[PDB]
């Protein structure tokens, strides 16, 4: 099985804006999660070829990863902070769906999600 | 904790280079390194990072291609057979530690098949 094309990170037809919440999601939230000891599996699209996961893209219909999210933020792809938050949530829930409770990789995703939620609790009000 | 990585230099050996050792570096190590399944074998097993607290309880003779590369570069081996033994140790460790038929084992098996092809073509001394 081939890998799918990665999720879109740029679309020049979409209107663009910068907000303080989107800036916080890049400079604080993404940065903090990126540097976490357990971030490595979540830093790029799951490479089902390299990792021999013939069923991954049968099971996970909406793939998402922090590499994509990073590019989306750097590209101003997101209009709403909530789109970005949804992408993080999709990443975590995909890991929970594909894997099983108490797999090490699930514990890694849980540690990143706990940190994520702590940083989102300090999301500034839209200026 | 991980152990220190295997020794790769021994200043109390004199230099002997041979066509068989040169072949082991320039052909055997090079070709295995570039194989699509080499990546887990290119450095020592990081039991700490990988959460394998029993790895070095079970494996007392660890070996990896990064170490073999360095040994060949530092003329650590006197003969080809010492180097061949290191490759074989690397494969057997994987077979000992991991469950038969797991991905990592299948990767090792593919590398070993390639290794045995290349050693069949070892030049004469």
């Amino acid at each position: 099985s081939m890998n799918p094309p990665p999720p879109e990170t740029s679309n020049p037809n979409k209107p663009k804006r910068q907000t303080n919440q989107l800036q916080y999601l890049l400079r604080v939230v993404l940065k903090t999660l990126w540097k976490h000891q357990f971030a490595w599996p979540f830093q790029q699209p799951v490479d089902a070829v390299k990792l021999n996961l013939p069923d991954y893209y049968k099971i996970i219909k909406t793939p998402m990863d922090m590499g994509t999210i990073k590019k989306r933020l750097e590209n101003n792809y997101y209009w709403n902070a909530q789109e970005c938050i949804q992408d993080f949530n999709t990443m975590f829930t995909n890991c929970y769906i594909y894997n099983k409770p108490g797999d090490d990789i699930v514990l890694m995703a849980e540690a990143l999600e706990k940190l994520f939620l702590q940083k989102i609790n300090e999301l500034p009000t839209e200026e | 904790m991980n152990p220190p990585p295997p020794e790769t230099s021994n200043p109390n050996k004199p230099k002997r280079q041979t066509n068989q050792l040169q072949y082991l570096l320039r052909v055997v190590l090079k070709t295995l390194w570039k194989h699509q399944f080499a990546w887990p074998f290119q450095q020592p097993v990081d039991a700490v990072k990988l959460n394998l607290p029993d790895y070095y309880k079970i494996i007392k003779t660890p070996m990896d291609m990064g170490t073999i590369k360095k040994r060949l570069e530092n003329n650590y081996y006197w003969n080809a057979q010492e180097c061949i033994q290191d490759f074989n140790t690397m494969f057997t460790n994987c077979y000992i530690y991991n469950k038969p038929g797991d991905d990592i084992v299948l990767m090792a098996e593919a590398l070993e098949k390639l290794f045995l092809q290349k050693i069949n073509e070892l030049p004469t001394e």
Partner: peptide, 10 residues
Amino acid sequence: SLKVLKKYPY
């Protein structure tokens, strides 16, 4: 403890 290729760094 088990090697899981999906969480193997590269």
